[PDB]
Structures are given as structure tokens and as C-alpha cells.
Design a protein around this ligand. Sequence first.
Ligand SMILES: Nc1ncnc2c1ncn2[C@@H]1O[C@H](COP(=O)(O)OP(=O)(O)OP(=O)(O)O)[C@@H](O)[C@H]1O
Ligand SMILES: Nc1ncnc2c1ncn2[C@@H]1O[C@H](COP(=O)(O)OP(=O)(O)O)[C@@H](O)[C@H]1O
Ligand SMILES: [Mg+2]
Ligand SMILES: [Mg+2]
Lengths: 147, 98, 241, 242, 242, 50, 211, 249, 244
Amino acid sequence: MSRDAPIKADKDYSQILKEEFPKIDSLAQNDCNSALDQLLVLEKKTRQASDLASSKEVLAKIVDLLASRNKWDDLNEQLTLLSKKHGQLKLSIQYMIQKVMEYLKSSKSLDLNTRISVIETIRVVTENKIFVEVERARVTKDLVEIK
Amino acid sequence: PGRLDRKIEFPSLRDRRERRLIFGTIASKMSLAPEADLDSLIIRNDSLSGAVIAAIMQEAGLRAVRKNRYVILQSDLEEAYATQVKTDNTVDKFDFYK
Amino acid sequence: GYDRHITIFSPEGRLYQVEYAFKATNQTNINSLAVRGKDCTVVISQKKVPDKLLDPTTVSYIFCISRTIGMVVNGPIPDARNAALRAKAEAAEFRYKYGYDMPCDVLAKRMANLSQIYTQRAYMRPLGVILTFVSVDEELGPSIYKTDPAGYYVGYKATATGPKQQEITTNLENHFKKSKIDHINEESWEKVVEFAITHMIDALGTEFSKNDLEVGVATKDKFFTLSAENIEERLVAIAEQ
Amino acid sequence: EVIELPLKNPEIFQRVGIKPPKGVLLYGPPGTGKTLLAKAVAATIGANFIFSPASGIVDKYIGESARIIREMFAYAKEHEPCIIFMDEVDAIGGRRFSEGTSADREIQRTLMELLTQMDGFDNLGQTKIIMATNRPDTLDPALLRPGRLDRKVEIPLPNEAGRLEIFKIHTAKVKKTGEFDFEAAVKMSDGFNGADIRNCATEAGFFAIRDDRDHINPDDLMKAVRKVAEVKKLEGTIEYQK
Amino acid sequence: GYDLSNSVFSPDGRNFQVEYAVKAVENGTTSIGIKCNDGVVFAVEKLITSKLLVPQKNVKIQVVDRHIGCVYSGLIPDGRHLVNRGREEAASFKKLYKTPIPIPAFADRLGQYVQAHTLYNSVRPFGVSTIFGGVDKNGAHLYMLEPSGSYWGYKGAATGKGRQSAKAELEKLVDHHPEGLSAREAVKQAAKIIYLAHEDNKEKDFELEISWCSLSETNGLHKFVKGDLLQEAIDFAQKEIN
Amino acid sequence: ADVKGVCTEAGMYALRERRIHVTQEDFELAVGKVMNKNQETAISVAKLFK
Amino acid sequence: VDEKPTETYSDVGGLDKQIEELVEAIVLPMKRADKFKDMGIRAPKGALMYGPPGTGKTLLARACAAQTNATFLKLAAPQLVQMYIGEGAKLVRDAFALAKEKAPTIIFIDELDAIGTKRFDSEKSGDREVQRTMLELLNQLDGFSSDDRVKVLAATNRVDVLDPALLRSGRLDRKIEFPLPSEDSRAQILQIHSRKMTTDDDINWQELARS
Amino acid sequence: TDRYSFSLTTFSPSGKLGQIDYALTAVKQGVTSLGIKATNGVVIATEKKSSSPLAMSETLSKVSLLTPDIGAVYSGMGPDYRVLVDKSRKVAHTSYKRIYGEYPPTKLLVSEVAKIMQEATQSGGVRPFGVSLLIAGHDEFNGFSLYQVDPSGSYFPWKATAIGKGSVAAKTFLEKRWNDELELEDAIHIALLTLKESVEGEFNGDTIELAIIGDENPDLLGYTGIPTDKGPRFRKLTSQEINDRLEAL
Amino acid sequence: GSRRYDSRTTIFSPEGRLYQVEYALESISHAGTAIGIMASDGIVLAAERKVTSTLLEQDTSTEKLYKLNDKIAVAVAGLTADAEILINTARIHAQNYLKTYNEDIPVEILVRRLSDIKQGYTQHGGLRPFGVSFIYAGYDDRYGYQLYTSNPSGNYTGWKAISVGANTSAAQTLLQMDYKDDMKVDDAIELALKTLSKTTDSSALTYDRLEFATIRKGANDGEVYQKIFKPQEIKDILVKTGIT
Ligand SMILES: Nc1ncnc2c1ncn2[C@@H]1O[C@H](COP(=O)(O)OP(=O)(O)OP(=O)(O)O)[C@@H](O)[C@H]1O
Ligand SMILES: Nc1ncnc2c1ncn2[C@@H]1O[C@H](COP(=O)(O)OP(=O)(O)O)[C@@H](O)[C@H]1O
Ligand SMILES: [Mg+2]
Ligand SMILES: [Mg+2]
């Protein structure tokens, strides 16, 4: 955001960890926690831009697990925790959410998924004020049809 | 006197009972929260003139259009109450005149 | 006529000369946030230096008036120095004639009384500085007393000063509403610094650096300040919270 | 919401059986566009419009000011829908006198004649007043009362991204090579009035025109938002509002 | 009103009399202060108003103690009164605590004195800025004291008409050496930015004066730069500006 | 005029009571009403003065 | 209209910057209006000129007006202060209507210290003839008459007296100080005065300028 | 130089001393306070207010002790009371506790503080203190007494009085509620009930400051085994105690 | 600076007349009526308070009547605040005379001393003078009972019957018709009350708003007893003289 140092440096690191993208994947197949530990580091940066690149990796990791209801709770939770603290500006983390929210929709192929997914989505958006709120209502709305 | 032996001074201090009577007259014109307790508002108002209360119904029914109703509720009344009665700041000044 | 040009009463009963003093302490645009810990009192304040050719180390607003009692100043630095000099002199004097160092309460009251006298005199201008006095006394615990240019002071659970201080009030109010006590329940003074920095970022929206901060901590029976190196440890420790 | 909504549709206001909302008071800093907005509202609705300054009606001939607003009023009652723009009402403002001279007492009569037309035995119909005041502290509690005036519109400075919204209207008009420094520009022109953002664009085009091109390059603008910002704050209003 | 005296005050935070007094300093002689590693190197532009004058026989540099240079601009009598006062303060410190006064301690006392005259209407505020520093036991330091009663540490300072030129090159001097520079080299750089600040005074002619207090050369004593060293500085500055 | 003011004031009270004849009670109310105007400006120099 | 043909800037000696500023403010928009129009930016609403009397300002607007081919209007604010409210208000309104009519026009207003300061709103503040004429000036320079052909030049003695609301951008745009002549400038102003009479090698204008 | 010796307080052509009239305006901008004299004590009460919710009102006193048997309470300016309370204690010691070895009579103390007022309206450089004080006390020669100190430099004894912004209404309250015989207990209940109408905020015992000059407390005496001395007749009530009297309304 | 805010408060007018003294006489006309009548056996001082209220304790008040010394008391008409200074100066001065000559101060000496202070304040310092008028009742051996009025300029004038404060003209005119030199203290008590009933400062004159004091040589052995009557002893005399 500020200074001219974060734009370049942070981006530079995300490139370096994107060359180390196969490494994160291989470990994720052996145990979830090992690769998860990498996502934590990525989503602590100071430039908004370098987190765009990195919020692909957060979505991809849980896709490689395929997907686990227990693991689902944590990913959406970690995001909520990062939003209150900073998120690299509170406006920044809302576009991150928007990317991961498309995945929630298309994951859907159980009742089981649908139920867990509405519990995470309602909470996120109570402190947000954008298009996130339309999407929350819509996924909530799948459970309405079932109701 | 003899010019003007009758002299009526009009207060704004009023009475609790006086405020109930302004509300009723208004209520005939447009019912304000007719499914909820009116009487809270009466207690809460404590300086208001008849004018502020006329401004209340009219501003509430502005908010009626927004909310897209043809009826005024107590929520409309409470925001009508909140503002139009908090003008000036002298809070700071009176810290050192306490 | 002269009911606004000297300290005489007006038909309003309000001294306009005195009002003008409070309308000059927020024009330096320095915010402060002061919180009472469970064993300490921490005060952090702005130290915005926009120049290459001003030495930032000597730009300061935290002056040690006793070895145990710090003082943080919001408002013009000539008046700050005069009020600091006077306060130091009195604190020393109290040791000399009463056999123990001046309490925070009474040091606040003494500057408060001098401020009234300066607005009693019609040729003397009051010192236009808001003084926050932080300490840990042994008879009052962690304490904050904040005096103002008129000569009014009171104790505080926490307090803020500056133009944007209303935002700071919101954070503090929530904190003590939830805890249901008049202080922070944190038993490490370092973490009360970390908390203070967090609420400063929340209130003002501004991301701080070690050269925008200046930190004073009164622990029990000593007052110290953090250097910019030590303040950087705290800023790294926000990332570890 | 105050003005336009009961003029076009009084049908909703009669149906509910609420009184039509009437009176707005505008106050803000210099330069914020109360005039610009006065000029704007008049178009939107299409209602008949009398822009009259209030320092403009004053004459040493007593009851001449009272005469002027009374006729203005009679015209407005005929020409419905109509909004009467009383601009800079602060000129004939203030209250008291009767130890003043008869010029003041006339200003007090005019101020009072205002008072007659609105409420009394005359009323507003689909007439409507907007009063503009540049200082609310010259302005008097008799006209800040509910009665007169349902919504008291306090207009701030243009917000941080409000100022960025104004630059867009203006930089639209210009021919340029492409300017991408507009985000940067609004950080330097912070604490600005909208009158001075308009000045930001006029200065940038000065430098463009002097160099003999018709394009505003971004470098011309960077310099420009700094050149206005230094001198603005030096001679700044330092207005205080209620 | 609020500008008749200095204990009138205004809601604008201004005090008027004091701000007015800075205008004398801003039309004063160019004077600089360079914070060096080993000390400080002062230099002052001394205008030559006539050929009748005796060169290097009129000084604006008076020593305080044996180790504090002090050079000032604005009203010369008023500044000579302020320096006269601070020669007493240095003597008092030396009497009571048996040490030459430390540079931060010296600044504190002077600030109090200048504060006193802005708090009373029965005495007149000062209108001079002094630049003073030296070498003490806590290291070399540099301070400039405003007639308001404000001082700070400085890595470079300037005052007078040609302060614009001086300060701009002092930024570049700290960008030449971000790890600081020798006192000996700073002689030649003090010369250079007086010469560049004489382009604000190029309707006039000048005499270059340089004085230093540095540990490396003068052993923590304040002395004047003279003879061949002074002439070397002149020759250096001459080639750079050519 | 003040004297005259009593006569008229007195007939407000008698009228209401629905008794024509003026009485001591009609009088006591009537002098209290006319004196009210005067007592209030006389309590501010009779009390809270120096 | 009291236009006299151009005085000419050559003949208004010294003060190079003042001459530079007027060209930039007036002539450049009037001649190069087409470029200002295509861009859609506004041509200066006013330029404030302030500083002590006799700094040449009159001479300059009168030169500029002939060159730019706008009429020279003569308006002086200390006159417009009267005891009669009606009479005093009337000539402001007359001068505004007539200017727009005779437009493009350079209105040259002298000594706007008679519009005074308003900083207060108390009972007495001028009785509402001094406050009132400040607000009548604000409607001159308000964009309810097109001030892109009219160009308002005004002279005033100090602005420090005057309330700073009137002084902001679009009131008045450029804020231009006129200092005293310097040593070298004095010599130029002396020479042109002397140029008018017999001129001889005895006289040295520089010599006279230094004394 | 100094040449301020020309009195700031001076006569106006319509009579009255203009400066003290101005100062009295400031008393009717301040907080409301009242005092009822019972035949078995005196009660004085005032309202605590705060400009911040993070201000503590237990560090804020507006009823203060001058001597153990004489308390004071103000309405007016905060700063002006702050300085003048210290001077009241000081002159009580110099003029009767170093001369007659005891605390001054309530009559004596009131007179002396009115002189301090008087000389702050005499000579230049000093404008009055913009407070009115109720000085309730007890002496052993005239029993209970309630005084009201004016910013004029005069005093008046009262049977019950009020000062502050809501004084006029409050004194009409006390007029029917006062009687020839009263109890201290019922005096308190009147005082709180009256100050209910002069408080616009909270009405807790934490925000209502109450103090009695009732009767002696030998637990505040600080020593025992001297039966001759009587403890402090003054006793400031803690917040919990004030809450009990709120339930006793 | 200092001279900026001064207006030269105490100076002559073109008539010769001191602004602050002229102003001072207006403010004494605000303050209540005080009457003094010199009988051939005493001096009666009778004053109607400028404040009365049902909540005002007036039963311990002695706000107009103050004893300067054992044979000299004053009644006050003017600012109570201003008067307080002169009252304690008088006590000091009378005691000082007693200390040095072991003889009681004559009435002339005490009045003259106070008068000098009032003159002095307009003469130098820029000080406002005391805006009070006192009526001194005093006994001395040499001139017997002596009655004196002092004005805020600082000048004293003897009388036999006189009134200061409110309704000075009305009180004086009634006194001229009724006063006789054969009057006793008994007769003077009745006259004072009647005069105050016709110069009343509201619409009623009452005991509780009356302060009353005499100095009578009817105490045994030619001694003088100053008695300041309580309002219920005033009440007794109020029914005696038939005011009530
Ligand atoms: N909302 C806006 N978008 C575009 N330009 C604007 C806007 N608001 C104001 N401006 C610009 O600023 C100028 C100044 O506004 P305007 O003349 O309405 O001032 P004002 O607030 O009425 O002051 P006064 O107190 O002198 O009456 C406008 O002419 C316009 O160029
Ligand atoms: N720069 C100049 N060169 C020559 N004479 C000048 C110059 N400036 C002013 N003067 C003389 O002084 C007179 C007054 O100046 P004028 O233009 O009328 O000024 P202003 O508007 O500043 O009051 C001119 O008529 C001219 O005689
Ligand atoms: Mg406008
Ligand atoms: Mg001219």
C-alpha cells in the first residue's frame, strides 16, 4: 500500500513461492497440515496485489484434499480471523472471499456440503458491505429449496 | 391592561398529559404505530414543543416511502425522536465551566 | 470590548480567551492513547516527522517529570517545555518538604491551580497544552490524571487526546464494557503496549512505524521509554498475535 | 426526498394522510456547491425557479424588502410547481433590534414577512422554499425550528472518495493523452472543497496550454494539485458550524 | 481583532505578533548549520553593503562558553541581547555544576527565556532565530531556536532569505552522506551552499564567513575558519557553481 | 387601567362558577391574577440580589 | 468605457514578474480561448492584485484591456459605501448588469477594503450595509453570470483585514503580491520618467536609485 | 512593567458592579446544588457529571472538607472552586487554629472567604471567582447553620436554598418541603428527589454526590481515649450508602 | 499592554465631576432605605432590608446593623460586600484609638478616617471607591449623641434626622414635618416605623424585614446600652406603635 518497497518485494516472494507451487501440493497429499502451514505465511503480506496471487493457492489446496467437512470449517474460519485483524486493508480481503465463494458453489454435490457451507457464509459477510452479501443469500437459498 | 388585559403566555415545558393530547390529533390524521405502545414516546419527550412532534410524524412518513409502506411504525418514530433534538456542541466547552 | 481579548467575564459568563486555548492543542495534530494495565500504564503518541533535516530522535513529546511519573503533551512545544519545567520543579520540591516524591494526583492538581491563576491574570496568557500524566503510584495503583489548559483535571480509566480522539474512545469503551473493569487484565507490560498499538491502528486507520510511534511505560516504581528498536520488536509482535 | 417527491407525487402524501414535507436549509463550507446544487435541483424536477440573492432585495425605502418577497410569493402561489431559492439569507438575517435604526427594523420586518408567508393565514401548497446560508451562526433559531424546515441538511466537505468523484466529471471534459495519476492526486488534494478541485483542472490546463498542446499530461496535473493545495490552506476559511 | 498584543489569542490558534516577528528573520541574512560527525560547521552570508566597510571586522558569530558557536539572523540588537543572556546562563551552569554547559541543557534555558516574552504584553516578543551547537560530553549536537520558543534537533538547518536554496542542497548533502560527513569536508560544502544561497541575493555582494566547533580539528573549542583554509573553501565553491 | 383590569378578571371567574354576583372569593382570585404580573419581576430584586 | 489606447508594458518599468503574471492570466485565455474551450476548462473568474498603492497596477489593466479588446470599466468600491441602503445597493446591481452587457469586459475595481471584513455576526457588525455589500460581491463572482469572458481585476491594499472566505479558489483564483521596487527596479522606473523630458549624460538613474 | 491596579470591577452608570453580574451568569450555567438545614443535621448535595465515559467520578469531588465540622459545595466553574477550596482551608488555620487553637465557627469562616472574593474584585489583574458556595457547618455556639456565599463578596444565611442552573425550581421544591421541625433522614430524601429534576442523566448513588454535616462519628476521630473531643460532624457518603437513600425515596 | 485596557476610570469631567462617584450614587439608590433619627436621649437606627424571602433566614441576620465599637454602630445602605471592608477597618481604628489614648473614640474621628479612604481611591490607584452610605449612631461625652451621614465620595455631614439609600427624598420630607427637638427615643421609634411604612420598598413592611437598633442612655448610671432588637422584639414594638 504505502512506500514503494512492498509492491516489488512482496510480489517477488509470491513468484518465488509460485515456482515452489509443486512442493506445497506434494506435501498436501501426505498430510493436510503440512501444506496448510504454507498458506498462513502467504496471506500475511502488506501489498494487496501479492494476496490476489496467493488466494488461488488457498482455494487450490482444499481442492487437492477433496475436501473434507472438518477441513472446511477451518479454511473459512481462517479468512474471518484474517479479515478482523487487517486483511491488508479491510477492502482487500473482500475480494479474496469473492474468489473462494465461487468454489463453495461448485463443490456442491451433497446435502452435507450445502448445510456446512451455509454456516460459514452467513458469518463472513455480517461485517462486509459488497456483492458477498448477494452471494451469501443465494447459497443460503439453495438450503431454502430443500426446506 | 385595557389594551391587552388578556395575555396568554405559551409554554413548551408542557406536561406529560399535554403531550398525549398532541399525539392523538396527529393520530387522527395518520395513525403512528397503532399496533405498538405509543406511550413510551410520551415519557421520552421532555422538552419537545408541539412543533417538533408535528415534524416527527411528517419525517416518519417520509421514511414510510423509503421502507415502502403506507404505514408508520414505532421504529420510524424512534429515529424521528433521535434527531432534530441534538443540535450544537457545547459538551467540550462545559468541561471547563463544570 | 475586551471580554474576548483578556480573561474577564462576558455577559454569557464564558471566558472566550480560555476557549481559544483548547483551539490550539488540536492544531499540532498529535493523537495520544493511554491505557491502564494491571501493573503498568502505557501511553503511546504520534511523532510525525516529515523532514529529512529534522533529527527524529530529538522530536519528542514524552518528558519525564519524575523518575516514576511520565508526562505526554498534546499541543504546542514552547508551552510544553514551560509546563514541564514548572512540574519538575514542584515534584522535586515535594520530596524536599514532605519527604516523599509528589503523587500523580497532586502534581496534576498543582498544574491545574497554576492554569487557573494564569487565566485569573489578564496580562498572563495560559499555557495552551493538554498534559496527560501517567504513573504507577503505590497508593493509587496504575493511574492517569489529565489536566487541561483551563485548570480542570480528573482521573481516568483510559483517555485519549488529539483531533481524532473520538475514534480512540470507541475502542476503549468496548474493551472496558466487555471486561467489566476499569483496566486491562494483562500482567505483562509489553503486551499492554501491543494492545495499545492495535487500537491505535483500529481507531485512526493508520498503519504505524517505529518512527511514527513514541512509547512511554510506567511500571511499578520506574518510568522508562522504549527506543525505536524496542518499538520495532512490538510491531513485529503484532504479527505474532 | 423533501422537495421533489411531494411536487410530482402529492398523491402518496394525501393517501397516507401525512402533511406534505416542505422546507430545507442548506449550510456547508464555502466552495462546497450550494449554488451548484441550487442550479441542479431546479433542472431535475423542472419546477419554476427564482434564484434571488438576499442581499439583493435590501433597500432604504422601508417595507420594500417586505414588498419584494410578498410579490415573489404571490407569483410562486400562481406558478405551482415552484421552488423559491432564497440564497444567502444570512444577509437579512440576525435577530433583535428596537434600539437599532429603522433599516434593521425593516430587515427584521422582512425576516418576519418571510415568516408570514410560510405559515400563518397563507400556507405553502406545492410552493416550497430552499434557503441557503453560508454561516449557520448568523442564522437564527426561528428559522432552525421544526416548522419551517423538516429536514435540516448539513452538507460536509466532499469526502475522500467524493473528491475523486468530482475529478471524474471534470477530467471527462478535457482532451488528454491519458492520465493515470488521479489516485495520487486525491491524496495531495485532501481536505479540499469542490470549488478548489475545479481549480486543480483549470491550473493543469494552463501549463498544457502554455507548453502549446491541448492535452493534459499527467505530470501537468501532479504539479497542479500541489500548486492549489499550498495556497488554499494558507488562506483557508476556518469556518465553524453548528 | 486579536492581534493588538501577544496574549490576545484567536480560535485559529494564531498568535500574531509572534508570526509577524518571524518575517524579520525571513528577511535576515542567510545562515546555516551543518550537523557533522565530529562537530558542527556554521557559515553565514555577510552582505557587503558598501566599499567603505572593513571586511571581516563585523561579526554575527559570537562564542558562548569556549565551545558553543552561536550565529543568528533577524534583528541584530535583539539577537545580541539573546546571546548576551545565554553567556550568563553558561556562566551560571559553570558556577553551580562546575562544567561547561551541555548543548541540550543550553537549549532548554534559552527556550524558557523566549517563552516569557510571548506570555506577557508588557514586554515585546523576540524576532530572531539562532543556530547554535557544538561538542559536549554527549556528542555533537545542532539546534535552531525559533522566536516562538521551539527548537528541535537538526541534521541541517537554515534561516534568512536564501533558506530555500540552502535546505534543498542540505537534503542532497545528507543523501551524499547518509552515514554523515567529516567536519573538515563540511567547510567546503558550507561554502558551496552559501554561494548557491547568494543567488537569492545576486543584486548584492557578499563575504563568506565560516566558523566551526569540531573535535577532530579544533578539539571541541569553537574557532573561526580563516587564512588558507577559508580561501580553499571559496575556490571550491567557485568551481562548483561554474 | 390596572384597577379596571381587576373588574374584568373578576367576571371570568364568576362566569365559570355560574354565579353572577361577585364575592370575596371571586375577588381573591381576581387580585391574585393581576398581581402575578408584578410579583414575578419583584422577586428578582427581592431575592438573589447582591 | 474609459478606454484610452494601450499604455504599453515597456513604458511601465521594473517589476518583471507582475508583467509576466497579467499576460498569463488575461491575454493567454482571451487569445487562446479556443484551446480552453475544446478542453472545457474555465477561463479565470478573477485575479486578485494586492499590495501598497502606486505599484503600477492601473497603467497595466488599461494597457491590457486595449490589447485584449475588452472595454475598460471604472468602478471604485469606497464610493459605493453610503448611508442610504437603497442607493448604495443599486449601483452594485447596475454595474453587474452593464458589465455583462458590454462583455467581454475587464472590470477594474479599486480599493476593495470598503467591502471590509465579516468574521462576526453580532448585533452590530456594520448594521448590515458592510456585511451586505460583501455578499453582493460574492454574487458577482458567482457563476450565475458567465465570467469566462469577464474577467474581473481588482486591487486592494491588504487581504489580511478581509475575511478569508471571499479569498478561496474561484474567487478569485490567482493571489498575486505586488512588492516595492528593488534597487535595480527603481532605476528603470526613474529612467522612463526621465525619458519624457530632456535626457543627458550628466544624469545616472542608478545613482539616484541607490540614494 | 505592570500598571494593572485599575479595578476591572467598576460601577456602571445604571448602577451595579458590572463584572460580578457577568460572573453570576457562570453560576447559572454550572451544575445544580442544594442544601437543606434540618434541626438535627444539615445535608448538602450536588450532581457529578463527566465529559467522557472513561472519566472516573470517584476521582472527582465537588463537595470537599474545609474543616471536620464544616463542608462546602459549589456551583459555577470547576477551576475557580479548585483553587479557592485550598485557600479556604488555609485561612481557617491561620486565623483561628493558630490563634484560638480550634476550627473556626461557621459564621467566622464564611465571612473570611467573602473577603477573599471581595479582594478578587478589587484592583486590576483579578476578576472574581465565578462560583457561589453553600457552606453548611456546625459550630458549638450557634448550632447548625447554612450559608450561601455570593460572587459579590457578600453572604446570606438561609433556612434552605439552592444554587446552580436549576436553583429557581429547586427552591420552590424546598419551600413546601421545609418545616420548623425536620429530620436529617427526611431532609436527604427531599434533597435527592429535588436533584432528580435537576439531573438529566443518571441518578445512581455513584453519580449523585451526597454529604451531611449530621452528628459526630467517633470512628473518623482517628483516636480514642479522649472523650472530650468529638469526631467529624461532616461525613461524605460513599456511593453504596447513597443508593440506600435512593431506595428510601 | 497595560495602558491598552485602561480607560482612565477616575478623572474629572468638564463639569469637574468624578465619573465613578456619580455612578456610585446610582447603585446606592438600588439598595434599601435606612433612616437615622437623633433623639435627645439616644439615636434610633431603622433599616428595611433589600432582600426578603420565606426561605431567607433573617432572624440571625444583622446585614445592615454592625457594631464598630461599644458606643458606635452603623446602619448600611449600599453594597454589603463593599461595606464589609470599611466595617472591619473601623473596628481596627476604634480599637487603635483605645489602645493609644485609653479613651473611647469620638464619633467625629472615626467617620473622618473612613472618609479619607474613599477620597484616596479616586485620587490614586485607579481604584473604584466604596459605593455605600452609612448612618453613624454614636455617643461621645463631648458632643453627646452625634448623627452623621457619609457619601461614597468621602465626605461626612452632620444631621438631626436623615435618610440614605432608596427613597431618600420621600423619607426626608416626612421627617421635616414630624421632627421636633423635644422628641425622646420612644417618640423616635414610632416616627421611624411610620416613615418606613410610607417609603416601603415593596407593598408591605414587616418585622422580619426590619432591622432595628437604638443606643440609649436609659441604662443605669448614665451608661449607654446598644440594643439591636431581634425581629420578634421588633414585632412587639410593631403592635405597640400600631403598624400592625
Ligand atoms: N458537486 C460538484 N461537482 C462539480 N464541480 C463542483 C461541485 N461542487 C462544487 N463544484 C465547483 O466549485 C464551484 C464553487 O461552488 P459554488 O459556487 O456553488 O459555492 P458555495 O458553497 O455556494 O459558496 P458561497 O459561500 O460563496 O455562497 C462550482 O462553481 C463548481 O465549479
Ligand atoms: N512601474 C512604473 N513605472 C513608471 N511609473 C510608474 C510605475 N508605477 C507607477 N508609476 C507612477 O505612479 C502612478 C500611480 O500608479 P498607478 O498605476 O495609478 O497605481 P495603483 O493602482 O497601484 O494605486 C502612475 O500614474 C505613474 O505616474
Ligand atoms: Mg454561493
Ligand atoms: Mg491606482
